[PDB]
């Protein structure tokens, strides 16, 4: 589903076609956290 | 167990003799698993005292000595 | 020390003990314990029913005194 | 004219509470059933966020954000912004122990920064004991050791909360066995401090002694060995004596499943201790499931714990879900109230100890003999240690502990400053008391009388009270002495001169300096002979 | 704990207050309820005993067995707990 | 059929206890044992008679439900 | 709820309660002595472990002393009052 | 697992606290009933997802969230984390400005 | 050597016993049966008051609570 | 009525007159009970024949001693809301 227009919009993971809420699992979120890594900060806390 | 006979009686009219000698007459509106008995339209004749008239009365079940059952009662059908 | 262990001392020693009865202030049983159960029932041996107000002594050769009636059990002394 | 100069949180209404307010007010008459408790520790070791849980339990409408600390007792806006507690705030609540008997808990939250340890002194003067928060990660730090030592010097009952235990699970990821050693070492470090005080025996802290508790304010966790044993007792029909299980849930005891008996030598190479087996591993599994397996484990968590989670509660984020799961399983922090009730003395029991330490008058003066009875019918004495600005900063309310008698609203009292003596009686005033309140941080429950042993916030007497004061009965005939000044834990080294930019506005600055001097217990304002105005 | 009826819970909140209780033999004991139990055994500190003839004594402590208590008078404020 | 929890007599142990029993007997001595029924053990027990006489009972067990009032002569431990 | 109300009836085939068992099914009158120092004579038609009974066609007699008596068509007796049950020799199987 | 960057839990000179364990013959015989069992005994302490879940908790937002509201595509500023933090040590003046 | 109540009453089953009730009447008879709650059933049982018989009752069931003691 | 759990409260907060086995009559607002039929009476008083009155307070009666109880008096006492229009 990664490259659909409104991915998961019809599934249980998001409320419906109005596309207002989402609720993922940890396999989903961790795969996504990996794919984003080129854009993300390495910082673990605000103290920096 | 025979307490589960008495609570099949409801709306029956009885005379209840409490252990204290109080005679209570009235209509059973419900009696529980401890035979705590709840009567309505009740008259307490406390021993050596004039009968009062009462609307309702809850008797803690251990005070019951015996209940005179209503004479027409179909004991054959309730003792099953 | 616990009560049940103490009764075992009387049982093992076969100590003559005097039992106080519940509510009955007027009689006490003197004898030897030979066994008991969790309900404080005492199999009692050579039991003598002391009648303290007369100091009379009836004798009752071995009884099960029901534990429900026991108030106190103490070692009987050399006096009579 | 609409100068919205607000500088602290203020509540338009009383919040709802589980207890009726009248039950709180009526419990004030019974000093057997109340405790005056400081909460202390290092900076950010979880003190305020722990009080947030007690607030949430006692106030049904109290809101905790899913991702920021409420910090109810950080009522000042600078405390909101700085993110640290700067001034101590009291909170009086009724809370039930494990017996489900209500106790009135008087609790001063205190700041954990070293600099503001003058606020810790002002709070220890009102308390009968202290609960020390020690971060399960950091362990004993500088101001932890200072807070323990200062409590023993002030003769407070020291008790221990090992806070932020989730940081072992979630940040350090120590195996449950190595978590037990980390917790144990914190207890050992604390008892190493107490054993320096050879001259006055301080009871040894251990969870076996019922005076240590473990907690995580973020995730609504707080337990002692007994509250976990009661969870097993509840869950398994009370088929065992929970006191005897609690007594075996710490130390080098191992459980043996073959024999159902508990043994003091390891039955295998890797046998978990009873703490590791029955307390830590279930806590790890409460977390690791919802951390790794939020999408699948939630029915099993519900089935095991006997918990309901709605459709939308099951869609919560990991942090607020674990906090909600723990809130519904462990329930209210009876383990804290046990620590307080059983290990901290009542104001009545601590009365003798408190007068020895804090009262300058002879210990066998009749007035001292009365205050040691903590007698609500005795002569009025009140010791106030802390001044709090009213919401417009025009004036201060003074916060304190009635030591004897009953303080009454709209009555006259003799107020004595720190300089009063039987020789130099000039530091004495008659003031009329305004309203009286039970302060509960951001809001105040007004009361007409406060009996001995309680804490009270007092309107109208603040003008002569520079820092601490003694308020005494006017009628009282024998020599009234004061309570001694605070003996602070530190000094004011940092010297900082001030000067108005307009010399025609110097009177306004001097009024400011009088006010901040009332606010900060250890702030000294001088005028130097050079004419500089100096804050230390 | 496991659930127990409100009268026993209120009795545990009567701890630390003054109470008065009458025993089945008729004596009235007034004191400060230092402990209660789920069987309503009671320990009274600071006790005053009143006999049915109206005489009295102070007693430093009393333990009264629960099934020998006829009734208690609790304090008033417990109606708010 | 019920579940019985030990009485909190633990603080009274080994202090001299007075007792009043059914029938208004008074027994006095060193309490040093109890059970869930509060079946007492009184050591060195002494009966106090209805006339001011006294009798040494020695070591004694008392069935708990005969005990009415239980009352130190001396300070709790 | 009712499971232990139905399982109860096993022991009554042989225990001391058998005098009630025979009193019901063979219809022997029993002279139930009670507390209050009163005698009830009647045919038990049910009983239980607690020794409740329902009595048909009862004669109650006591001394009040002069003898007095009362006739009760049907009764339920709470078993805690039952001292002593006797198969009355002044009656028989019916 | 005990990562070797975590210092060992030891201090060289602390007295071990007194463990007041129950003792004596009557007390070693105390047994827990046969059904009482740790509150998640059959659940494994960790799954293959547990290490990843522990990683997400400290992830940059949104990845420390498993649920939330959607956002507009225009709202999500993909690069904003990059210039919020200090400029890397080698970037030209053109870039630093 | 212990002689517990149940073995004792079992050894008396089918033998003559005296049973005394808490309220002073005594019943002498053959103890035909006992149960695990210590009710007593006697046969040929006869009631004695002040040491005097007042006649044969026949078979009796003494409910468990009434018994003061029972013995040979 | 009472303790039938759908109607557990059936006489709660009524003023009730309680007769004990010693013949005493207590009167008060019956506002809690227990499975042992313990009862808690607020604002309780006792009454005896001559009628002699005494005030007690909040009385807890151990259930073992209760003979019976009766309704003596009612509980104490004190088109909804909304709206859209104007007039
Ligand atoms: N991991 C974890 N962090 C917590 C917990 N409780 C509080 N914190 C965090 O620790 C920090 C400090 O919490 P505070 O409640 O402000 O602690 P505090 O001691 O009152 O701070 P000061 O009073 O100013 O010393 C905040 O960032 C909280 O989010 C906890 O239980 N677990
Ligand atoms: Mg704080």
User: Count of H helices and E strands in chain D?
Assistant: 17, 22
Tokens at H88, concatenated: 């890397």
Distance (Å) of CA D146 to CA B21, D183, D197, H93: 74, 20, 13, 50
d(CA D92, CA D94): 7
Cα angle: D386, vertex D391, D392; to 5 degrees: 115
E52 exposure class (CB count in 10 Å sphere: 0-12, 13-18, 19+): exposed
First to last CA, chain J: 49
Which residue do the tokens 């308390």 mark? D127
C23 exposure class (CB count in 10 Å sphere: 0-12, 13-18, 19+): exposed
Residues 6+ apart with CB under 8 A from A41: H60, H81, H82, H85
Tokens at C28, concatenated: 């006490």
- E12 contacts D100? CB cut-off 8 A: yes
d(CA G77, CA B69): 10
Residue from D40, D45, D46 to probe ligand 1 pocket by mutation (most atoms less than 8 Å from CB):
D46
d(CA D272, CA D254): 7
Contact in structure between J18 and J41 (CB atoms under 8 Å): yes
DSSP SS3 for A9:
coil
Q: How many residues does chain J have?
A: 87
Residues 6+ apart with CB under 8 A from D320: D66, D67
Nearest-atom number in ligand 1 for the CA of D79 is 24
Measured from CB, residues less than 6 Å from any atom of ligand 1 are D 43-49, 69, 71, 84-85, 111-113, 164, 166-167, 216-218
Distance (Å) of CA B78 to CA B4, B73, E78, G51: 9, 9, 46, 18
Known binding-site positions of D for GTP? 44, 46-49, 69, 85, 112, 164, 166, 217-218
Q: Characterise B30 by phi-psi region: left (phi > 0), alpha (psi -120 to 50), beta (else).
A: left
DSSP SS3 for F17:
strand
Residue B73 C-beta-side C-alpha neighbours within 13 Å? 25
Q: Characterise H20 by phi-psi region: left (phi > 0), alpha (psi -120 to 50), beta (else).
A: beta
DSSP SS3 for C27:
strand
Alpha-carbon dihedral sign for residues D364, D368, D372, D373: positive
d(CA C59, CA C46): 7
I62 to chain G, any CB pair closer than 8 A? The answer is: yes
Nearest-atom number in ligand 1 for the CA of D110 is 23
Q: How far is H5 from chain A (nearest CA, A)?
A: 17
Alpha-carbon dihedral sign for residues D95, D98, D100, D102: negative
Residue D296 carries which DSSP code? T
Contact in structure between H39 and D231 (CB atoms under 8 Å): yes
Contact in structure between D12 and D434 (CB atoms under 8 Å): no
Known binding-site positions of D? 44, 46-49, 69, 85, 109, 112, 164, 166, 217-218
Tokens at I43, concatenated: 């046969």
Distance (Å) of CA D410 to CA B29, D413, D469, D487: 58, 10, 19, 32
- Cα torsion at D501, D507, D511, D513 (round to 10°)? 50
- C67 contacts F59? CB cut-off 8 A: no
Beta-strand pair G67-77/G53-63: antiparallel
How many residue pairs bridge chain D and chain H with CB atoms within 8 Å of each other? 143
Contact in structure between I22 and I67 (CB atoms under 8 Å): yes
Nearest CA to ligand 1 atom 21: D44
- I59 contacts G84? CB cut-off 8 A: no
Cα of D84 from ligand 2 centre, angstroms: 6
Which helix (DSSP H) or strand (DSSP E) does residue H84 occupy?
helix H80-84
CA-closest candidate to residue H39, choices D428, C15, D279, G66: D279
Which residue do the tokens 């079992």 mark? I10
Neighbours of I71 (CB within 10 A): 20
Backbone angles phi, psi at E59, to 5 degrees: -135, 135
Residue D322 C-beta-side C-alpha neighbours within 13 Å? 26
Tokens at D394, concatenated: 């025009």
F41 exposure class (CB count in 10 Å sphere: 0-12, 13-18, 19+): buried
Distance (Å) of CA H69 to CA A39, A40, D479, H74: 21, 20, 70, 15
Distance (Å) of CA F27 to CA F35, F48, F73: 19, 6, 12
- G83 contacts I60? CB cut-off 8 A: no
Tokens at D297, concatenated: 């484990």
Which chain E residue is nearest to residue F19, measuring alpha carbons?
A: E63
CA-closest candidate to residue D534, choices D492, D503, D504: D492
Cβ contacts of D247 on chain H, cutoff 8 Å: 22
d(CA E16, CA G26): 63
Backbone angles phi, psi at G36, to 5 degrees: 70, 5
Neighbours of D187 (CB within 10 A): 23
First to last CA, chain E: 17
DSSP SS3 for C32:
strand
Residues 6+ apart with CB under 8 A from D296: A25
Backbone angles phi, psi at D32, to 5 degrees: -65, -30
Nearest-atom number in ligand 1 for the CA of D112 is 25
Cβ contacts of B70 on chain G, cutoff 8 Å: 74
d(CA E42, CA E61): 10
| Breaks after residues in chain D, judged by C–N over 2.5 Å | none
- Cα torsion at D459, D460, D464, D466 (round to 10°)? 30
Distance (Å) of CA H92 to CA A39, D81, G93, H80, H95: 21, 36, 120, 19, 5
Contact in structure between D215 and D136 (CB atoms under 8 Å): no
J14 exposure class (CB count in 10 Å sphere: 0-12, 13-18, 19+): buried
Peptide bond connecting H62 to the previous residue in cis, omega within 30 degrees of 0: yes
Tokens at E62, concatenated: 């009393």
Cα angle: A16, vertex H50, D293; to 5 degrees: 35
CA-closest candidate to residue G78, choices B64, B21, I62, B78: B64
Chains with 3 or more CB pairs closer than 8 angstroms to H?
A: A, D
- I67 contacts C62? CB cut-off 8 A: no
The three-state DSSP-derived secondary structure of chain B is CCHHHHCCCCCCEEEEEECCCCEEEEEEEEECCCCCEEEEEEEEECCCCCCCCEEEEEECHHHEEEEECCCCCCHHHHCC
D238 exposure class (CB count in 10 Å sphere: 0-12, 13-18, 19+): middle
Residue F68 C-beta-side C-alpha neighbours within 13 Å? 18
Contact in structure between E47 and E30 (CB atoms under 8 Å): yes
- Cα torsion at B46, B48, B51, B54 (round to 10°)? -20
d(CA G80, CA D329): 45
Cα of G55 from ligand 1 centre, angstroms: 75
Residue from D41, D45, D49, D142 to probe ligand 1 pocket by mutation (most atoms less than 8 Å from CB):
D49
- E78 contacts J58? CB cut-off 8 A: yes
E67 to chain F, any CB pair closer than 8 A? The answer is: yes
DSSP SS3 for G75:
strand
The gap from C-alpha H2 to its chain's centroid, in whole angstroms, comes to 12
d(CA B19, CA B15): 13
Contact in structure between C28 and C52 (CB atoms under 8 Å): yes
Nearest CA to ligand 1 atom 29: D69
- Beta-bridge mates of residue H22: none
Contact in structure between D199 and D302 (CB atoms under 8 Å): no
Backbone angles phi, psi at E13, to 5 degrees: -80, -15
Cβ contacts of A45 on chain H, cutoff 8 Å: 58
Residue D278 carries which DSSP code? I
d(CA F6, CA F11): 13
Contact in structure between C42 and C65 (CB atoms under 8 Å): yes
CA-closest candidate to residue D87, choices D66, D117, D67, D65: D117
Contact in structure between D151 and D130 (CB atoms under 8 Å): yes
Cα angle: D488, vertex D490, D496; to 5 degrees: 110
Distance (Å) of CA C21 to CA C69, F21, J30: 5, 11, 39
Beta-strand pair B64-68/G67-77: antiparallel
| Breaks after residues in chain I, judged by C–N over 2.5 Å | none
Residue D72 C-beta-side C-alpha neighbours within 13 Å? 26
d(CA D103, CA D27): 8
CA-closest candidate to residue D358, choices D127, D125, D157: D125
DSSP E strands, D116-219: 129-135, 157-163, 212-216
Tokens at A39, concatenated: 């854009």
Distance (Å) of CA D245 to CA D99, D208, D263, F77, H30: 17, 11, 13, 26, 9
Cα of D44 from ligand 1 centre, angstroms: 5
Contact in structure between D226 and D98 (CB atoms under 8 Å): yes
CA-closest candidate to residue E40, choices E62, E65, E22: E65
Which helix (DSSP H) or strand (DSSP E) does residue D49 occupy?
helix D47-58
Residue H33 C-beta-side C-alpha neighbours within 13 Å? 13
C35 exposure class (CB count in 10 Å sphere: 0-12, 13-18, 19+): buried
- Chains H and C touch, contact meaning at least 3 pairs of CB atoms under 8 angstroms apart: no
Residue H53 C-beta-side C-alpha neighbours within 13 Å? 24
Tokens at D230, concatenated: 């009661």
Resolution (A): 2.9
Q: Judged by CB atoms within 8 Å, which residues 52-81 of H form the interface with A?
A: 52-53, 55-56, 58-60, 63, 66-70, 78-79, 81
Which helix (DSSP H) or strand (DSSP E) does residue J19 occupy?
strand J15-20
Nearest-atom number in ligand 1 for the CA of D217 is 31
Neighbours of B2 (CB within 10 A): 23
Residues 6+ apart with CB under 8 A from D214: D136, D161, D162, D165, D183, D207, D221, D222, D223, D224
DSSP SS3 for F71:
strand
Alpha-carbon dihedral sign for residues I25, I26, I29, I30: positive
Known binding-site positions of D for Mg(2+)? 48, 85, 109
Contact in structure between G42 and G70 (CB atoms under 8 Å): no
Beta-strand pair C56-57/C42-51: antiparallel
d(CA E69, CA E53): 19
First to last CA, chain I: 20
Residues 6+ apart with CB under 8 A from D65: none
Neighbours of D297 (CB within 10 A): 20
First to last CA, chain G: 36
- D101 contacts E12? CB cut-off 8 A: yes
D239 to chain H, any CB pair closer than 8 A? The answer is: yes
């Amino acid at each position: 589903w990664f490259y659909d227009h409104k991915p998961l919009a019809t599934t249980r993971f998001v409320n419906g076609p109005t596309y207002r809420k989402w609720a993922f699992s940890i396999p989903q979120m961790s795969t996504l956290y990996r794919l984003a890594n080129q854009l993300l900060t390495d910082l673990v806390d605000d103290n920096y | 167990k025979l307490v589960r006979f008495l609570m099949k009686l409801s709306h029956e009219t009885v005379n209840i003799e409490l252990k204290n000698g109080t005679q209570v007459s009235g209509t059973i509106m419900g009696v529980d698993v401890a035979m705590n008995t709840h009567l309505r339209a009740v008259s307490m004749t406390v021993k050596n005292k004039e009968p009062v008239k009462l609307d309702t009365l809850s008797i803690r079940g251990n005070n019951i000595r015996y209940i005179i059952l209503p004479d027409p009662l179909a004991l054959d059908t309730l003792l099953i | 020390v616990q009560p049940v262990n103490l009764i075992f001392r009387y049982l093992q020693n076969r100590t003559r003990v005097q039992i106080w009865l519940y509510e009955d202030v007027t009689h006490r049983l003197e004898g030897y314990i030979i066994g008991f159960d969790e309900f404080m029932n005492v199999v009692f041996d050579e039991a003598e029913e002391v009648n303290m107000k007369t100091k009379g002594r009836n004798k009752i050769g071995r009884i099960l005194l029901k534990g429900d009636n026991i108030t106190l059990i103490h070692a009987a002394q050399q006096e009579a | 004219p609409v100068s919205k100069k607000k500088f602290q949180a203020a509540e338009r209404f009383l919040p709802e509470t589980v207890y009726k307010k009248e039950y709180l007010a009526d419990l004030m008459d019974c000093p057997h059933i109340m405790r005056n408790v400081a909460i202390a520790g290092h900076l950010h070791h979880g003190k305020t966020t722990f009080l947030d849980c007690l607030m949430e339990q006692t106030h049904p409408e109290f809101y905790r954000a899913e991702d920021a600390d409420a910090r109810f007792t950080d009522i000042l806006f600078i405390e909101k912004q700085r993110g640290c507690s700067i001034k101590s705030q009291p909170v009086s609540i009724v809370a039930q122990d494990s017996r489900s008997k209500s106790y009135l808990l008087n609790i001063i939250d205190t700041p954990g920064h070293v600099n503001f340890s003058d606020e810790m002194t002002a709070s220890y003067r009102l308390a009968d004991g202290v609960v020390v928060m020690v971060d399960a990660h950091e362990g004993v730090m500088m101001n932890t050791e200072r807070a323990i030592r200062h409590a023993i010097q002030e003769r407070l009952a020291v008790t221990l909360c090992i806070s932020k235990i989730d940081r072992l699970l979630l940040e350090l990821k120590l195996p449950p066995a190595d978590a037990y050693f980390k917790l144990r070492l914190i207890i050992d470090q604390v008892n190493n401090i107490l054993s320096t005080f050879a001259e006055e025996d301080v009871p040894v802290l251990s969870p076996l002694n019922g005076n240590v508790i473990f907690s995580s304010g973020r995730y609504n966790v707080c337990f002692s060995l007994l509250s976990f044993s009661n969870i097993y007792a509840k869950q398994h029909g009370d088929s065992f004596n929970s006191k005897e299980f609690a007594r075996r849930l710490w130390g080098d005891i191992y459980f043996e499943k073959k024999t159902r008996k508990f043994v003091k030598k390891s039955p295998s190479h890797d046998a978990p201790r009873t703490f590791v087996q029955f307390i830590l591993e279930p806590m790890y599994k409460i977390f690791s499931q919802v951390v790794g397996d939020v999408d699948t484990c939630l029915p099993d968590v519900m089935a095991e714990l006997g918990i309901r989670l709605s459709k939308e509660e099951q869609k919560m984020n990991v942090r607020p879900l674990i906090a909600l799961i723990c809130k519904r399983f462990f329930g209210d922090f009876s383990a804290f109230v046990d620590l307080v009730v059983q290990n901290i003395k009542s104001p009545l029991e601590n009365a003798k100890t408190k007068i020895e330490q804090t009262y300058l008058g002879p210990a066998d003066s009749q007035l001292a003999q009365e205050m040691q009875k903590c007698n609500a019918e005795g002569p009025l004495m009140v010791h106030t240690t802390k001044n709090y600005p009213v919401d417009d900063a025009t004036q201060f309310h003074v916060f304190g502990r009635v030591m004897s008698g009953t303080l009454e609203a709209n009555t006259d009292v003799r107020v004595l400053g720190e300089n009063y003596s039987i020789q130099d009686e000039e530091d004495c005033r008659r003031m009329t008391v305004g309203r009286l309140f039970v302060r509960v941080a951001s809001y105040q429950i007004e009361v007409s009388r406060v009996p001995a042993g309680c804490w009270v916030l007092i309107e109208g007497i603040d003008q002569p009270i520079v820092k601490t004061a003694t308020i005494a009965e006017l009628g009282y005939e024998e020599d009234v002495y004061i309570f001694r000044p605070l003996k602070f834990n530190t000094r004011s080294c940092v010297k900082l001169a001030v000067e108005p930019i307009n010399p025609s506005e110097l009177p306004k600055m001097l009024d400011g300096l009088r006010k901040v001097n009332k606010s900060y217990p250890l702030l000294t304002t001088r005028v130097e002979e050079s004419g500089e105005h100096v804050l230390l | 704990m496991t659930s127990v009826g409100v009268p026993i819970k209120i009795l545990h909140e009567a701890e630390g207050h003054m109470v008065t209780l009458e025993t089945v033999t008729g004596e009235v004991y007034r004191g400060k309820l230092s402990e209660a139990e789920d069987n309503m055994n009671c320990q009274l500190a600071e006790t005053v005993v009143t006999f049915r003839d109206g005489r009295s004594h102070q007693l430093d402590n009393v333990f009264i067995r629960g099934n020998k208590i006829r009734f208690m008078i609790l304090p008033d404020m417990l109606k708010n707990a | 059929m019920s579940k019985t929890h030990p009485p909190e007599l633990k603080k009274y142990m080994d202090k001299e206890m007075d007792l009043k029993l059914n029938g208004n007997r008074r027994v006095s001595g060193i309490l040093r044992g109890f059970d869930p029924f509060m079946n007492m053990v009184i050591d060195e027990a002494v009966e106090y008679q209805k006339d001011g006489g006294s009798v040494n009972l020695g070591m004694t067990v008392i069935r708990g439900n005969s005990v009415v009032i239980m009352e130190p002569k001396e300070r709790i431990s | 709820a009712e499971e232990l109300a139905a399982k109860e009836d096993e022991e009554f085939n042989v225990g001391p309660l058998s005098i009630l068992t025979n009193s019901v099914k063979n219809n022997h009158q029993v002279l139930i002595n009670c507390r209050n120092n009163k005698k009830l004579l009647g045919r038990v038609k049910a009983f239980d472990r607690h020794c409740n009974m329902v009595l048909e066609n009862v004669k109650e007699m006591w001394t009040e002393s002069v003898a007095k008596d009362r006739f009760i068509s049907k009764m339920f007796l709470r078993g805690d009052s039952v001292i002593l049950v006797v198969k009355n020799p002044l009656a028989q199987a019916e | 697992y005990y990562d070797p960057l975590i210092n060992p839990i030891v201090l060289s000179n602390l007295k071990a606290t007194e463990e007041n364990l129950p003792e004596g013959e009557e007390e070693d015989e105390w047994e827990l009933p046969e059904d009482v069992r740790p509150i998640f005994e059959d659940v494994p302490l960790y799954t293959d997802n547990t290490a990843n879940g522990l990683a997400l908790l400290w992830a940059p937002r949104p990845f420390n969230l498993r649920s939330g509201r959607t956002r507009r595509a225009v709202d999500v500023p993909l690069v904003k984390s990059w210039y919020r933090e200090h400029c890397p040590a080698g970037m030209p003046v053109k870039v630093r400005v | 050597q212990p002689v517990n109540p149940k073995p004792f009453l079992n050894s008396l089953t089918g033998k003559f016993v005296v049973c005394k009730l808490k309220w002073g009447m005594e019943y002498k008879g053959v103890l035909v049966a006992v149960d695990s709650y210590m009710n007593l059933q006697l046969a040929h049982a006869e009631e004695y008051i002040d040491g005097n018989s007042q006649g044969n009752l026949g078979e009796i069931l003494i409910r468990c609570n009434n018994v003061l003691y029972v013995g040979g | 009525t009472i303790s039938k759990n759908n109607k557990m409260m059936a006489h709660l907060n009524y003023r009730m007159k309680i007769i004990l086995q010693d013949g005493r009559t207590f009167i008060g607002f019956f506002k809690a009970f227990d499975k042992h039929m313990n009862i808690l009476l607020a604002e309780c008083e006792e009454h005896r024949q001559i009628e002699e009155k005494r005030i007690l307070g909040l009385v807890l009666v151990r259930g073992e001693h209760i003979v019976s109880m009766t309704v003596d008096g009612p509980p104490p006492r004190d088109g909804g809301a909304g709206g859209v229009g104007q007039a």
